[PDB]
Amino acid sequence: MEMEKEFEQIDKSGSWAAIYQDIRHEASDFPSRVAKLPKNKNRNRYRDVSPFDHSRIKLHQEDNDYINASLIKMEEAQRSYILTQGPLPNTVGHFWEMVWEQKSRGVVMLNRVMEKGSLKCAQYWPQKEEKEMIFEDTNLKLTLISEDIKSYYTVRQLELENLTTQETREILHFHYTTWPDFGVPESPASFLNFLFKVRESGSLSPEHGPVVVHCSAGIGRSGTFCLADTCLLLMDKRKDPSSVDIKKVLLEMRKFRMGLIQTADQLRFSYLAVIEGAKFIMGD
Secondary structure, three states: OOHHHHHHHHHHHOOHHHHHHHHHHHOOOOOOOOOOOHHHHHHOOOOOOOOOHHHEEEOOOOOOOEEEEEEEEEOOOOEEEEEEOOOOOOOHHHHHHHHHHOOEOEEEEOOOOEEOOEEOOOOOOOOOOOOOEEEOOOOEEEEEEEEEEOOOEEEEEEEEEEOOOOOEEEEEEEEEOOOOOOOOOOOOHHHHHHHHHHHHOOOOOOOOEOEEEEOOOOOOHHHHHHHHHHHHHHHHHOOOHHHOOHHHHHHHHOOOOOOOOOOHHHHHHHHHHHHHHHHHHOOO
């Protein structure tokens, strides 16, 4: 069923909450035993949001290999993403260790450091060229190279150095700065523009490791970003684009991380973004 007609049907009948709860009922449940060990309590921002054991990202250290991060592997679309929580004061070094070890080119950030008067993630990148950051627990150095501030997002060029080997790499930071404190955006136009800028950079392409994407918990806004990207790529690839079923794609992604798409409003926004984005994918 053409999603656009499905959309009007749900909107006229006002049943978004019912659709969304069906997804929650049918979603996968896999163990997350490593996340819940006592030694990891200060590595989790929220007690109810954990990576599944089967898909979690492991840090390459014998000490403690745990980080709240999951690998979402989309087999038909041929895309992979790492979804993670906003880093905590005690996990900023782990975060950059994971970016290094997984060979990522880009980091996608969908929240502000402070929202609703409270801190939603650590200030984990440097704000001035001449004031670099050193993460002593993981032996990395991070330097701001350049910054391009636009009305709806900011793109930063960063240099990450492995201090053990003195290798360096360029990381691109894509920061969407205008998601509202409450609700979802009224139009998906600026979010789609942002997604296409990430794509154009190479950060989503198979020559690099998976993109790292986060918000505060790494399931809500972050889920919207990967769901829309994968659905639009499948509409590109298939003989019949109307065959793409966004609810089924979302349930597949939920095999790899719990809780993706947090509200019925985020579900509706995801439909809207894919519907409007398709009016480029089919040739404009």
